[PDB]
Amino acid sequence: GSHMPFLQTIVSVSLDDQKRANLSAAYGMICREELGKPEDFVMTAFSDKTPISFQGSTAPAAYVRVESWGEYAPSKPKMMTPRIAAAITKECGIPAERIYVFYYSTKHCGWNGTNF
Amino acid sequence: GSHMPFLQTIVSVSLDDQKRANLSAAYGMICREELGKPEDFVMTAFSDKTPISFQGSTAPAAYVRVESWGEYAPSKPKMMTPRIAAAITKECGIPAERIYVFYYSTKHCGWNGTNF
Amino acid sequence: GSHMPFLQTIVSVSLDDQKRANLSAAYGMICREELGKPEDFVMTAFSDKTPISFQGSTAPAAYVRVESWGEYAPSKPKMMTPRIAAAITKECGIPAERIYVFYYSTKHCGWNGTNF
Numbered sequence: 001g002s003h004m005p006f007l008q009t010i011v012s013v014s015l016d017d018q019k020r021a022n023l024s025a026a027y028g029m030i031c032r033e034e035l036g037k038p039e040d041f042v043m044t045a046f047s048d049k050t051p052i053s054f055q056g057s058t059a060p061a062a063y064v065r066v067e068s069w070g071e072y073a074p075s076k077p078k079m080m081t082p083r084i085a086a087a088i089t090k091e092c093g094i095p096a097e098r099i100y101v102f103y104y105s106t107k108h109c110g111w112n113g114t115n116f
Numbered sequence: 117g118s119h120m121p122f123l124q125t126i127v128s129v130s131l132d133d134q135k136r137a138n139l140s141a142a143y144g145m146i147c148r149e150e151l152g153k154p155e156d157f158v159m160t161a162f163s164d165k166t167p168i169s170f171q172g173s174t175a176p177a178a179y180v181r182v183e184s185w186g187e188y189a190p191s192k193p194k195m196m197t198p199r200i201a202a203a204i205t206k207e208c209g210i211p212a213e214r215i216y217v218f219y220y221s222t223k224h225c226g227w228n229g230t231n232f
Numbered sequence: 233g234s235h236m237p238f239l240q241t242i243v244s245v246s247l248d249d250q251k252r253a254n255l256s257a258a259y260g261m262i263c264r265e266e267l268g269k270p271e272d273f274v275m276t277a278f279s280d281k282t283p284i285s286f287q288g289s290t291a292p293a294a295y296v297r298v299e300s301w302g303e304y305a306p307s308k309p310k311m312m313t314p315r316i317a318a319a320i321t322k323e324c325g326i327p328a329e330r331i332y333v334f335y336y337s338t339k340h341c342g343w344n345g346t347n348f
Binding site for chain 1: 158
Binding site for chain 3: 004006008017020021024041042043044045046047067104106107108109110111112113114115
């Protein structure tokens with residue numbers, strides 16, 4: 001079904017190494033449990049200090065882009081969002097009402113120099 | 117039709133708070149008038165100082181990624197691009213010939229910890 | 233077929249001007265030879281110093297997002313990935329096993345203030 005998951009987290013707050021490590025840990029679990037495979041591997045990029053505007057405010061907000069090969073079973077993104085958002089709230093203090101999560105997928109994506 | 121619009125603006129110039137606030141204002145109008153709903157809310161992320169190369173030049177250029185739930189009525193992106201590009205030119209001095217705008221959408225996207 | 237190609241390169245290492253210029257040169261060739269048209273033009277954005285986690289490690293890794301108008305002939309992404317990854321390894325020392333490349337496309341995308 002879904003493979004090679006990549007998450008980009010864009011946040012207006014500053015993150016440090018502990019918080020990125022904690023986020024990567026959380027995302028990895030969420031991906032393993034909700035997206036499919038235990039032994040899966042997950043790539044996780046953090047763009048912090050990125051100003052974000054939302055509802056007329058620049059208070060801390062987040063956007064996460066989830067990508068993967070194939071296409072999603074329609075139940076899985078529903079299960080993932082509240083976990084992703086909870087993990088962002090815990091590590092970053094950003095309330096869920098200022099967190100956007102979008103999921104995309106493709107048939108074309110490549111790793112170790114060879115497409116899936 | 118189209119919901120929960122997110123714009124990421126990637127620019128090679130430096131932006132300050134006034135210019136991001138002006139861009140967020142402009143995007144909000146463009147989204148409300150062209151994309152659908154008045155009371156809509158719009159998330160707007162600014163990655164400035166990001167080097168961009170184009171036509172063999174690294175002079176100031178821009179890329180904007182527009183995302184939203186569902187799929188676009190085919191007339192709306194056509195209407196949005198010239199407004200987005202005009203707003204970037206005004207706030208950033210980037211000529212329209214170095215501005216790329218791409219639109220994506222998904223059926224899976226989530227807010228306040230719950231998918232749309 | 234495929235038009236207006238945009239590449240975003242996200243790397244956890246620092247890039248300098250020579251290395252971005254070399255990457256933009258390489259991407260341009262790869263796009264011209266594999267994606268379609270000689271006289272094509274290619275936009276290339278570099279987000280360096282972006283922490284990335286993968287397989288439990290934050291050693292240097294890369295993610296590249298390739299975007300373009302239309303949709304891909306299914307052979308072309310297969311041909312592009314190993315070139316993109318080779319170019320990243322050469323300029324950045326990142327081994328191919330920590331390089332992800334994803335390809336997306338849209339029917340809606342705009343330049344010089346007018347959609348394709």
